[PDB]
Amino acid sequence: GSSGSSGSILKIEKVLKRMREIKNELLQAQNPSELYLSSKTELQGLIGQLDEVSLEKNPCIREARRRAVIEVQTLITYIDLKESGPSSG
Questions:
Q1: Domain 1-89, CATH
Q2: Distance between CA 37 and CA 55 in Å, rounded?
Q3: Fewest CB within 10 angstroms: 13, 17, 22, 59, which?
Q4: Angle CA 22–6–53, to nearest 5
């Protein structure tokens, strides 16, 4: 019994642990014109982990997981809306 390898909550905590960091690295970024590609790509990866804590026989899971999906997807989107734009204007 050695914590570190096992865990259903810790695996998720990370999905948000990095997400937060990224946001910052993006804000300070002067010319994120390129980050929009990396910053996003990385985000998508995180969510993937959530797949592990798939709908389990517990309320904390179904909730935590979901709440997390929207906590990470919110950024991935904010980027897409920023990337695209009107050619003229």
A1: 1.20.58.120
A2: 30
A3: 59
A4: 60
